[PDB]
Amino acid sequence: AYTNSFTRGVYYPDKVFRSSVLHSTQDLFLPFFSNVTWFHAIHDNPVLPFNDGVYFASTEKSNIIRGWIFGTTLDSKTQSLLIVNNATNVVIKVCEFQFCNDPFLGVNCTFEYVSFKNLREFVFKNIDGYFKIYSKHTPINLVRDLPQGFSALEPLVDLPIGINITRFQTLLALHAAYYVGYLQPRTFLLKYNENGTITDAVDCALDPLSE
């Protein structure tokens, strides 16, 4: 399935506070009104490409989406990133795993680390050696789809893990719905409001009025 992403997937591009300014930035962002591929927690866990970087989201009611996997081939020939959320812990690992043929969550290594009415949104990207995660949690008024309104994601972590990621997957809990979109290099104009909330943005390559 496919659906329209609207103005979602903007995020704070650097660790610098700004306010009362319209700031031009060129970076990997989700293009406005782009097609996002759409999937369900019932029956639906295919492996997707990663390309330049992945916007990911899920519409939720009881915390069924609980992790992700990233790599080339997921088959112990090389490092693969694993991410899981479990109660008071958020957990990150990059050993040369072999996973299940059908992964789910039952209710030569280099690094390890530890920290519908819900919408959870994320951006996953790479910068040479470095993997970054950004996120937002919000209420939503309706089950239907991604909101036709604006909100900016904020950085969780940076991982110095250096993996050649070309594919990814997500993990479901078993005793919701989720989305995939691809970033592109876009010049953006970001509206940092009087408090430094990014309240709006223009995707400059969208249409002649945005240019």
Binding site: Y12, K15, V16, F17, R18, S19, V21, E154, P155, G196
Partner: protein
């Protein structure tokens, strides 16, 4: 970040990940202190034409 200025506490509500703030001229305009983790204003010390 070497520079000359008056330092104060500020109304600049930095988000938890932010280390600095900047003016239009790229010059840093606030800093998080790396020890007490409070959000210092920077104002270049009082000056004007004579």
């Amino acid at each position: 970040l070497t520079g000359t200025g008056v330092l104060t506490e500020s109304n600049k509500k930095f988000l938890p990940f932010q280390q600095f703030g900047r003016d239009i001229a790229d010059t840093t305009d606030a800093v998080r202190d790396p020890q007490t983790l409070e959000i210092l204003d920077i104002t270049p010390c009082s000056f004007g034409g004579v």
